[PDB]
Amino acid sequence: FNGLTGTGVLTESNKKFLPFQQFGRDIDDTTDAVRDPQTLEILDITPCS
Amino acid sequence: DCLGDIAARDLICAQKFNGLTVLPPLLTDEMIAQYTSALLAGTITSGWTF
Ligand SMILES: *[C@@H]1O[C@H](CO)[C@@H](O[C@@H]2O[C@H](CO)[C@@H](O)[C@H](O)[C@H]2NC(C)=O)[C@H](O)[C@H]1NC(C)=O
Ligand SMILES: *[C@@H]1O[C@H](CO)[C@@H](O[C@@H]2O[C@H](CO)[C@@H](O)[C@H](O)[C@H]2NC(C)=O)[C@H](O)[C@H]1NC(C)=O
């Protein structure tokens, strides 16, 4: 996603991103939510088992 | 995705990305409560004989 790499399960989420913020982050500097660049939707990321 | 009670379903999601897992204890808290109740009832009714 726009230079941000990783691996996991993408799901729809109910976060409220600010108009300029791109991707969320946890309390341990891990990514948890990403803006979809084409259609502006918030995708949650959960690692697979 | 919410949290049902303490360990009702939990989706078994104690995992945090880069290989870090938490294992459940062997004895659930109900068994420990039963042990304490048994000890306490025994010490009330029989003294130190049991
Ligand atoms: C970027 O993505 C597409 C590129 O075409 C556009 O968004 C969609 O465009 C189609 C028709 O071109 C519409 O039917 C959809 O409703 C659009 N989606 C959204 C979410 O608006 C547009 O050029 C760009 N979209 C955004 C959100 O910036
Ligand atoms: C493993 O994943 C499955 C997903 O299919 C879980 O099935 C869920 O079961 C509950 C209880 O009947 C339902 O309310 C859910 O709707 C089911 N999930 C889906 C996606 O339909 C199953 O519970 C999971 N196992 C454990 C131990 O968490």
Distance (Å) from CA B9 to ligand 2 centroid: 9
Kindly state whether A7 is in contact with chain B, defined as any CB-CB distance less than 8 angstroms.
no
DSSP states of chain B as a string? ----TTTS-GGG----SSS---PPPSS-HHHHHHHHHHHHHHHHHTTT--
Instruction: Give the residue, out of A39, A41, A42, with the most ligand 1 atoms within 8 A of its beta carbon, to mutate for a pocket test.
Output: A39
Main-chain dihedrals φ then ψ at residue A27, nearest 5 degrees: -85, -5
Resolution to 1 decimal place, in Å: 3.2
The structure was resolved experimentally with cryo-EM
| Residue linked to tokens 């049902």 | B4
Q: Which residue on chain A is closest to B18 by alpha carbon?
A: A47
Q: Rounded CA gap, B45 and B12, in Å?
A: 42
DSSP assigned state of A28: T
